[PDB]
C-alpha cells in the first residue's frame, strides 16, 4: 500500500457487504437492525 502510493504521489449493495438479492431476503425478515421498508 505504502510502496504503490509513493510512486503515484509523484504523478450493488457494497454498503452492507451483501449480495443485492440477499439484502432483500435479510431485510424482509426484519433481520437487519433498523432496516424497515417504506
Partner 1 sequence: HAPHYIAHRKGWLSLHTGNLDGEDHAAERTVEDVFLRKFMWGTFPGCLADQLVLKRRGNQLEICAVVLRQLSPHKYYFLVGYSETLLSYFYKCPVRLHLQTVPSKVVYKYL
Partner 2 sequence: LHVDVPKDLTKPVVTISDEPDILYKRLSVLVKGHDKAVLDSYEYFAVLAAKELGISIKVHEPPRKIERFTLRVQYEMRTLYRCLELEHLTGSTADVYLEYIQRNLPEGVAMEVTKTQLEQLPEHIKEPIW
20 touches partner 1 (CB under 8 A): no
Please give the angle made by the CA atoms of 25, 19 and 14, to the nearest 5 degrees: 120
- C-beta closer to RNA: residue 24 or 30: 24
If one counts every other C-beta atom within 10 angstroms of the C-beta of residue 27, the result is 16
Taking the C-alpha atoms of residue 3 and residue 33, their distance in angstroms, rounded to an integer, is 39
16 touches partner 1 (CB under 8 A): yes
Positions that interact with partner 2 (CB under 8 A)? 13, 20, 23-24, 27, 33-38
Positions that interact with partner 1 (CB under 8 A)? 15-18, 26-37
Amino acid at each position: 500500500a505504502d510502496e504503490r502510493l509513493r510512486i503515484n504521489s509523484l504523478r450493488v449493495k457494497r454498503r452492507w457487504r451483501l449480495s443485492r438479492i440477499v439484502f432483500r431476503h435479510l431485510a424482509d425478515h426484519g433481520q437487519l437492525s433498523g432496516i424497515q421498508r417504506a
